[PDB]
Every structure is written in structure tokens, then in C-alpha cells.
Amino acid sequence: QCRNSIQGKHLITDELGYVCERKDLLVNGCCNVNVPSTKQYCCDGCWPNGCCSAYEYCVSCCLQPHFELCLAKCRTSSQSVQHENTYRDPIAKYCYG
Amino acid sequence: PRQVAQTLQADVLWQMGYTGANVRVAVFDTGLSEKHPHFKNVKERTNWTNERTLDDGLGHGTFVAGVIASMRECQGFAPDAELHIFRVFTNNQVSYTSWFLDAFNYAILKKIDVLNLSIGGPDFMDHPFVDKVWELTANNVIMVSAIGNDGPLYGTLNNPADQMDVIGVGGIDFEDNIARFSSRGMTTWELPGGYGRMKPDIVTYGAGVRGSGVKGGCRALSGTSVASPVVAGAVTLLVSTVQKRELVNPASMKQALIASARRLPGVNMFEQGHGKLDLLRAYQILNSYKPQASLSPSYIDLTECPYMWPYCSQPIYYGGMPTVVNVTILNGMGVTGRIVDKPDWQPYLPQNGDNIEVAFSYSSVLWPWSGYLAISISVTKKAASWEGIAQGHVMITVASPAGAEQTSTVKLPIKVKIIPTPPRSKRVLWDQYHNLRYPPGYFPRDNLRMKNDPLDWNGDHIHTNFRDMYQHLRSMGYFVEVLGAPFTCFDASQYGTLLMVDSEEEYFPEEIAKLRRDVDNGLSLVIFSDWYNTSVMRKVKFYDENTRQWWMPDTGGANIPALNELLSVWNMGFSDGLYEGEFTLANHDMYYASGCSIAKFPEDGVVITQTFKDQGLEVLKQETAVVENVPILGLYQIPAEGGGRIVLYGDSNCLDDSHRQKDCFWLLDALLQYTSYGVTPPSLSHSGNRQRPPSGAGSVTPERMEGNHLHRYSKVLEAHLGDPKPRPLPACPRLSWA
Ligand SMILES: *[C@@H]1O[C@H](CO)[C@@H](O[C@@H]2O[C@H](CO)[C@@H](O[C@@H]3O[C@H](CO)[C@@H](O)[C@H](O)[C@@H]3O)[C@H](O)[C@H]2NC(C)=O)[C@H](O)[C@H]1NC(C)=O
Ligand SMILES: [Ca+2]
């Protein structure tokens, strides 16, 4: 069984690191490795400052060689906003560093 | 004395050994006392405010926790519930969204099953907060939230109770009547282009409910902040009752509450939802429940009501704007779903069900645990003269992961009423496109005296804060359709009048040209303006604590410079002076809340003017001054043959419902009569308050305040920040009927 990022609207990241669309999610919670679209530890969309446009890619980059830690640190938090109601980087609102 | 838990037959479930055991409940409130004797299973209290105390100085968090899980002297639904206390408000009910983000992260970390949020907010564009709430529900958190205590005004829903993934809880009294404070109306995220969803989800007891006191005993409180904990405790007890816990997800729980709810007679679905919480029937439904998809509303009956107001307040004809029903899809098979195919609209030939064409828009992925299905229903060309009930059913196959897809095929009955198209006059196009409002930007109150509510935030839709006005129009025969697109995107030959009220938006040059052509062709304009003044705007700047920022108005009460840009093609204009006071018109009382005047009007206008108070001087230098002959209203028929009409009025509060003092529904009826039939209204053309229409000569024209930021929230102007210019005219929306 795999601990998958339950949140994902489109993507899913398992404790291993695979990022897979929602159509390629297995029964045991693991991602479909066989499909080419499932690349693990994919930092796609992650800017050099440590912010990513997707929460699941934020988790996968954060899992680069901790799953709950990466899940929590990639959620938009207090430090992710300015004036309490606007992101300091909307296009990269999910940051792992 | 009353026992809320006992009244809902929570005892009948306590006899079964189900008492909220092994169910985690989080309370997002002002905190709890360390050793309150009314609770046996308070696991942790956390403070997310800047005040160094977990305790409850106001007594609100204590009351909420008691209603949910009290055991002594006034029992809660789930005495064995695991209480989690989140002190995210201060003693004054002040909470920062960043504190909410941290607290919600904590809640997801602790894997709470039920989360009560008794105090929400009007700011649904607080994107970090809404993203956090979606993240929360997606993680299997049944979020019960109060819809707000801003009723009985429509458009007063509070975030996050207005989200598809959150159980919105309204308030009834112990007599099963919707509480006056309880928020109502559709969601307003989807304006102007779209239509709002159905809220609240359910309504429970929220007036006089006894709950734990700060130190002990019990006390009675009121508010949807009271109804919400009742539903949260009932949901906690229900979760404890169910045998297979995997079947318990936000969607399945919401569906059990939706199906088991007892419909309140005489209450529309946007006040009550599906009905009042029924705990025993909910237990039975959860007992028999199997993973499935369902629809809120589960049927589309534009006839059966008052439950289906506003959908029964008018029938649908040919040439009408598509009737959009935003149906919330509750998918209990998985957090992510998928509509398998273009939903199959199967009409009923035997009973004339082919007179309706149903277009479908919907989520590409149904998430989190739910989604939307906007059904756009339109009559056909043949039925343009066919009265009757068109009946069909829309078959939606929602599929969810497992290997085989979890196919749930759901019937959505669609029983709509159809009539032949009304004449031009009966059809009124309410301008929603050019409305700008809070949450996004600071658009000040249309009445400067109302210090309590310094924002225009109730949607300004005919079903939200103009609900009384829309109901009045419906009772007057007018069919009120909504323009959610620029002027270029509506057949002006359909409507006799276009009603633009408290318009804060700019105008495309193409929009202005198209509107001028429409007016020459026969389209009419009723522009209920509102106050504008650079100096008053500067003095009315306020400190927003939610953002800890000094907000200046992005425009005044109405975007008078933009309205003047639109009106210059007809030589008309608006002033910048603030005026206010009681007055009368044709033996009817009135109240000029906070409006401007008509700086420029052509000579042939049937104008009316009266004396008011120079509220601008009051705002600036706190002095007093009565102004003689301030033009507030103006009528003008375009000289071009077959031309339109233009009515200018300076304040929008006499139609709004927010904090009404007087009523001008009579005057709006008269003005719609003028703009749709030509017959002059004697109330203004034979009035003794007529005068020479102004000229605007020598009077400095109002200008956009230097450094304004309206372009940041404008669908028309680009966020250029330097000499902002209108965007290119957008393409008109289109639908592929299925
Ligand atoms: C029914 O209610 C739902 C929930 O409020 C409405 O959903 C919203 O619909 C708009 C469509 O304009 C979505 O816009 C988004 O735009 C971005 C732009 O890049 C696009 O990438 C997204 O895929 C999406 O299309 C918006 O996200 C969506 N919100 C949610 C929470 O799903 C819906 O419009 C209503 N139905 C109507 C008005 O017919
Ligand atoms: Ca407005």
C-alpha cells in the first residue's frame, strides 16, 4: 500500500515520489509507473527559489533524494501570503523551501 | 429547559451505544477553558491568535463545544466525540487568514473527521483560504460551516459555508422557522457570467439553543454560529453510528443529511437547502447507503415551489437567456470523479419533453469529493409559442477510480415550465456584467452613514440584495433576465430596457458603440448611479484589519467617471458632490442615502430636483450645509426615431436591500414603465420639482482618483498600472446544446 497525496485534483504523489494523473492511480494507492507520464521526483514547474505551481509537484520535488512533512510544507501557509489574503507568488504558491 | 440533543432524538441513538465515539471533531472558535466540567474528551486546545491564552474570554468557543459534545446539564449530540479546540479568533472575534491557514494545516495533520467553523467571512476571493478549505475537504474532513448571521438579506453567504465541499448550515428556531439572522441566497462566485449554487445545505436549530457556559451552567445563544455546531454534533453522532467507516466521506455524509432532511414547508431551497436535519432518518439512510453519485437539487422542477424559488418565479420562453441550474454533484465513490460522457439528455416525447434543449457544462474532474454540473436549459424555436410542462431526464454517469470504474448513473429529472416569448417590454435585462464588488477590491458602501457595513459585497444580483426588488418586478409582470456579458453579447431587440444599477465597471469602446446602436434601435437604459467624490473617497479610506492595510476606494459609490464616459455620447454626465437626506416624490417618501448629482444633462430632459444635505462637507470638515436644487434624477428620450430612453439616478440604496431606510420600488417600477412603454411618468413630469436641466458648464468634471486601482479588478481595463486601457472586446459565450 502507498500513502498518496489525497488532495490532488489532477495529480497524485505517493510516498515513493511518483506523480501520476488521477486516471493512473492504482488500488493500493500507488501511481502507475508503467505509464510514461508517471515520473518520480519531478520538479516540473518548480522555480529556483523553491516554489512550484502544483502542490503534488511541490511534494515530489520535496521528496527528492518525510512524506507528511512534504505534504505539510507544500500547503499554502502563513508565510505564503502577504496582507493575509494574497499570495506573494500566485503562480508558485506551493513552496518547499 | 430545552435540550437540543434530546429534541433531535440523539437519545434514541445513545441507547444503541453510538455516542460519537472514535470521531474527531475540531472547533474553530474563540477557545475553551482548561478544565471545563461539561466535557470528558477534550484532547487538545491550540491558540493561533497573537493573544497569549488558550482560554475563552467571550464564551463562544465554549458554547460551540458544549452544543457539539456537552454531557452535563445541557447535553451535546456526541458526548464521546473527541473534541479539538482551535483558538483562531481573539476575544473580539478577530482572525487573520494566515492563522486560518496554519490552523487548517494542523487540522489536516490531526485527521479530524468533522470540523465546525461557526464564524466565516464574506471574502470568498481569499484564494489561500479557499484553496486551504478545498485541501481540507479533499483530505476526508467533513466541514460543517455556518452560512453567516447576516440574514434575512440574500447574498449574505459566508465563506467557506458556500463551497460545494462544505456543509452549509443555516438556522431555524425551535419552531422550525428559518431564523432571521440566517444567511440566504445563492452563491455569488459565478457572477456575472454564471449562476450560483444552492445553499445552505441544511438548516438546524440556531436560536435559543442552550450550551455550555464559560465556567459552567448553560446559556442560550443565537446565530448560524449556533446552528452549525448542532449539525456538526449530529454529523459526529452519525459518523459514530455507521458500521463501515470507509463509506463515510464528505460526499456520503452530505448525501445522507440531504436525503434524510425534512423539507420545511413554505421555505425555498436557497433558505433551507434540502430541509431540517433529521437524525434518525439520516441514521437509516446511512445504514442503507452505498457509494453513489447524487445531485443537489436532485431534480430540476422549475414548477414545484416555493422550494424551487427563484426557478419557479418565472417560466422559460424562447429568446430568453439560458436558464442555468448549477447542480452540485455529490460523488460518494471517490474524492476525484469524472463525467463519463456528455450527459445524456433524454427527453419525454409522450409529454412534449423535446421542447427543451439542455446544454451541459461541468468539471473536467469532480474534486474534491464533489463538483458542479451547470445545466443550461433553453426552449427551442418550435416551442416559441408552446405553453406547457417540458419533461425529461438527464442521465449523468459519474465514474470514479476503483479496476473497473465505479459507474454511478444518476437520473436528474428536468420538469420545466414553458411559455411563448413575452413582448419586448416585459423582458428586463439586469446588468450584472458591469458590477464590481468586494471580495476582490474595496468598493465602498453606497450609503456613507452605514459605518457598520463599509463594503458593497452582497453580489448586487436580482437574487442577492436585490431579491426584494426582483420579487417586486416578478409580481409586476416583468421577466428579469441577467446580462452576464458585455453589451455586445445580447440581442437588444429582445429587451425593452437595460437596468444598470450601482455600476462600478468601466466600458469597452465597442461596448459603448454597441449600446449606442441599441439605444437608437430601441433599447432603453435605467442607470441607478451612486455617489462619487475624490475627496470623500479619500476621507472614507479605512483600515482593513484582515489585511492590516489602509484601503482607499477603487471607485466611489459608482464609477462616475466611467458612467460619464458612457454617457458623453448622449451629452449627459454626473457630478461629484455628495448629497443626502429624506425627501418625497409624487406623495411617496424617499431617502437619498449617498449619491451624486447630474452635472450635465441635455436641455430636453424631464428633470426633477430637490434640496438635500451636502454630505461631502460633513465627511471632510464635519460641517453642515443644505444644498438648493440638487438634480438627482433625469429623464431623456433619444431624438432619433425608434430611439431608446435614458434615466439617470444618483443613488442605488433605494433598491438595494442591505440597510434600507425607505423604498423606491415604486420609482423603479415607474422608471421601467418609462423605459419600456414610452408613456411619461406623471410622478416626475408633472412634479413641482422640475427645473431647467443642467449644462455642466463651469462645473469641473469628476475625474478618476489619482493612483486608483480599479483596473486591478476590472473585466474591461487591463492591469497595466500606467494609463490603463480597455482590453480587446471578449468573444461572446456560446453553448452546444445536448
Ligand atoms: C457552478 O459552480 C461552480 C463552482 O462555483 C463554478 O465553477 C467554476 O467555473 C469556472 C468557469 O468559468 C471555472 O473557471 C476556471 O478558470 C480557469 C482559468 O484558467 C481554468 O483553468 C479552470 O479549469 C476553470 O475553468 C472555475 O474554476 C470553477 N470553480 C470551481 C470551484 O470548480 C461553475 O462556473 C458554475 N457553473 C456555471 C456558472 O454555469
Ligand atoms: Ca454594484
Residue numbers in the entry:
A (entry chain B): 74 to 138, 165 to 196
B (entry chain A): 190 to 591, 598 to 933
What do the authors of the reporting publication say about this deposited model?
Site-one protease (S1P, also known as Membrane-bound transcription factor site-1 protease (MBTPS1), or Subtilisin kexin isozyme 1 (SKI-1)), is a membrane-bound protease that mediates the proteolytic activation of transcription factors, hormones, and enzymes required for lipogenesis, the endoplasmic reticulum (ER) stress response, and lysosomal biogenesis, among others. A zymogen serine protease, S1P matures through autoproteolysis of two pro-domains, with one cleavage event in the endoplasmic reticulum (ER) and the other in the Golgi. We recently identified the SREBP regulating gene, (SPRING), which enhances S1P maturation and is necessary for SREBP signaling. SPRING activates S1P by dislodging its inhibitory pro-domain and stabilizing intra-domain contacts.
We determined the structure of the SPRINGecto-S1Pecto complex to 2.3 Å using cryo-electron microscopy (cryo-EM). The Peptidase S8 protease harbors a catalytic triad of D218, H249, and S414 and the oxyanion hole residue N3383,16. We did observe density for a putative calcium molecule in the GIFT subdomain within an acidic pocket near the GIFT-Protease interface. Our cryo-EM map for S1Pecto-SPRINGecto shows density for a 7-sugar tree at S1P N515, the form of N-linked glycan that is homogenously produced in HEK GnTI- cells. SPRINGecto presents a cysteine-rich fold that we term the Cysteine-rich enabler of S1P activity (CREST) domain (residues 36-205). The final model for SPRINGecto contains residues 76–138 and residues 165–196. SPRINGecto makes protein-protein contacts with all three subdomains of C-form S1Pecto and the total binding surface between S1Pecto and SPRINGecto is ~1200 Å2. SPRINGecto binds a somewhat hydrophobic ridge beginning at the GIFT subdomain, running along the protease, and terminating at the P-like subdomain. In contrast, S1Pecto co-expressed with SPRINGecto forms a stable heterodimeric complex lacking the cleaved S1P A-domain and efficiently cleaves an exogenous SREBP2 peptide.
